[PDB]
Amino acid sequence: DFVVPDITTRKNVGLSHDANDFTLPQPLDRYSAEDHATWATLYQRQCKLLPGRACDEFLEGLERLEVDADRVPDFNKLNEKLMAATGWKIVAVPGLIPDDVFFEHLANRRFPVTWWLREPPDVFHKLFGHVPLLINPVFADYLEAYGKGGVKAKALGALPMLARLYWYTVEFGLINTPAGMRIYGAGILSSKSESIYCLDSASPNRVGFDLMRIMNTRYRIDTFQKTYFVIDSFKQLFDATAPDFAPLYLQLADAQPWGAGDIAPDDLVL
């Protein structure tokens, strides 16, 4: 029955965005005291739960970028540190943006960050979850290479195959370490409960990273992942982008995808 405006619409009232690249100056005046307090609450919650769960590089990135514990960060201030580390910067966007625009940003070492915050894929998820690893030069190079692939993928109708790769790496990836399994996916790192389940539960599959397998795997957004893909190094991700994806897309185009909860005959199951 009744339809009401969504959070993206409400938050962006009176604001504008580039019609081509979808950026805007970060609207600092729009963050209320409640927003800063919500940020602080989420930050404190995650920083209590993540030690021994997040990969070490993630927690180090928070500190090296001086990500504010007590307020929504000033993007420009964060950029001074990020630019010096890896030549990356974050740019504010209104919310969900078109894929070609998103890929063009990453291809140019710009990471789009939704500016607004949830009330008590918002700025907490996109900044706290996604940005700290951009100080890692190997991970940053993986994201740049990913972005550069957007033109080819769009031309071939293969953007959803790249979306699966992004989902199962950047958003929901795990990294194995001698100290045990750790988390690098931003969607897990900003989550209250998925960081617990993804390491502690016997329920989800933990499967070794395989590029073709992943690009042939469905995902859903409404639920905890049924399968997590595990890398041994960020180098594995960057190296996965080396070959020509065009013949991989065409091979996959006619295949039946793996379901979100499937185990494939060739999986290294961890």
Return d(Cα 187, Cα 85) in angstroms, integer. Answer: 23
Q: Considering the complex, what minimum distance in angstroms separates the CB of residue 149 from Co ion?
A: 18
Tell me which stretch binds Co ion (CB under 5 A): 181-189, 201-209, 215-223, 261-269: 181-189
Q: Considering the complex, what minimum distance in angstroms separates the CB of residue 84 from Co ion?
A: 24
**Residues in 150-179 at the binding interface with Co ion, rule: CB under 5 A:** 171
User: Residue 105, annotated ligand binder?
Assistant: no
Q: Considering the complex, what minimum distance in angstroms separates the CB of residue 121 from Co ion?
A: 5
- Closest to Co ion by CB, 125 vs 213, is 125
- Closest to Co ion by CB, 8 vs 252, is 8
Which amino acid makes up residue 256?
Q
Tell me which stretch binds Co ion (CB under 5 A): 3-11, 68-76, 182-190, 231-239: 182-190
User: Residue 130, annotated ligand binder?
Assistant: yes
Residues 6+ apart with CB under 8 A from 22: 93, 94, 97, 98, 101, 112
- Do 114 and 94 contact (CB within 8 A), yes or no? yes
Q: Where are the beta strands (DSSP E) in the chain?
A: 89-93, 110-114, 174-175, 182-183, 205-208, 227-231
Residues 6+ apart with CB under 8 A from 240: 209, 211
**Residues in 46-65 at the binding interface with Co ion, rule: CB under 5 A:** none
Instruction: Tell me the site size for Co ion, rule CB under 5 A.
Output: 2
Q: Considering the complex, what minimum distance in angstroms separates the CB of residue 157 from Co ion?
A: 23
Return d(Cα 29, Cα 35) in angstroms, integer. Answer: 11
- Closest to Co ion by CB, 223 vs 256, is 223
Residue of 241, 22, 55, 67 whose CA lies nearest to 143: 241
- Closest to Co ion by CB, 163 vs 252, is 163
Residues 6+ apart with CB under 8 A from 97: 22, 112
Q: Considering the complex, what minimum distance in angstroms separates the CB of residue 218 from Co ion?
A: 18
Q: How far is CA 110 from CA 106, 142, 198, 244, in A?
A: 5, 13, 29, 23
Which amino acid makes up residue 77?
K
Tokens coding 172:
């929901």
Tell me which stretch binds Co ion (CB under 5 A): 7-15, 57-65, 180-188, 255-263: 180-188
**Residues in 186-215 at the binding interface with Co ion, rule: CB under 5 A:** 186
Task: Report the SS3 class of residue 174.
Answer: strand
Question: Which residues face 227 on adjacent strands?
Answer: 205
- Closest to Co ion by CB, 73 vs 178, is 73
- Closest to Co ion by CB, 21 vs 171, is 171
How many residues does this entry show for the chain? 270
Q: Considering the complex, what minimum distance in angstroms separates the CB of residue 113 from Co ion?
A: 10
Feature table: binding site for Fe cation? 125, 130, 171
Residues that bind Co ion (CB under 5 A): 171, 186
Which residues are documented as binding site?
125, 130, 171
